[PDB]
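How a chain folds remains the central question behind the approach discussed here. For one protein, we set the task of working out the structure tokens from the amino acid sequence alone. The sequence in question and its structure tokens are set out directly beneath this paragraph.

_____
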Amino acid sequence: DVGTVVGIDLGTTYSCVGVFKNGRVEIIANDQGNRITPSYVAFTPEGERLIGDAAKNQLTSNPENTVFDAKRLIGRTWNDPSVQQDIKFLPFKVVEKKTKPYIQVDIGGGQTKTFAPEEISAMVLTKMKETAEAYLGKKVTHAVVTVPAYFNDAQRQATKDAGTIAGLNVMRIINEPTAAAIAYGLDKREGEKNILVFDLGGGTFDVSLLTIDNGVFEVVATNGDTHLGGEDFDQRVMEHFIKLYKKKTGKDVRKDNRAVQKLRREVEKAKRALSSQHQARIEIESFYEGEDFSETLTRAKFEELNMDLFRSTMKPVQKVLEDSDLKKSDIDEIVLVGGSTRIPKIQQLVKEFFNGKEPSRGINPDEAVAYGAAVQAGVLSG
């Protein structure tokens, strides 16, 4: 009937899919061997449609026809002031169509097409569905899908709609921070608890005050920063090296985007390394005008380059507490979500904010939301 239902984190920057198999949640790897998949769609001049890692990986040679951040636009009208702000920063065309912000791309050979934001997310969701189905060795028809807690009626419906386009019946839309809590078993626990969820993604920062009472969740207050994430930490590190280069050679890397992008790729990997190691080597062969890049980033440097950004995450946490009439002591559970929460310095800051109190631990913070979504998908068959 519903078959094996899947749990999908449909993220602004990365998506994740899980399933309940053999008494356990399995987070599923994609055709590229990754347990997270970029929420990107690229159309090539030859007319190929890329989704996920291959869309993300080419993109530097294709800014106009590579689509991301559709989640910023889904469920919104063209004239929403938020949309009008966002599209300033997007490198693809967005036009007014049927009152909505439609994405216009060159599909190949100069052929122009428009897509509703839920059409682009449907392509991503189709990628998640194939990832799942290859794992399971069978077709999937039903899904649990997560959304931010601040999502309104239209944004929830448009996500359901993206699922229907993708061949998915979205049985449950769940809030992302609730899914995270579920992954940690916090919905089981007896009596009333206040849960702070701190979700530092690749492009957005979400803080949520949740209440659990008899396995029923209530979102009391949300804050954060719509345009803060790990990518902002990457950018800081580029500017540092482009500056060091424009000092050691006189040359300016920004004249060549391909150089700037190659730096971006290596910075990303260095950033991930610095969560485990204390130094990382950034080495780009044939980086600008045949010449080579070697420099080495320390964790101490990474942190200094980002310290004000790291510190600015605490102010939404204070506002959330204020808006919900609670103080630090009132928090019984801290859940970290997002790849950036693996940054050792961000963990230190959250703990010190809460007076030495430890967060929940044991689930990859990139995977926690889909995990919880898979916990509920699990119950929806059996």
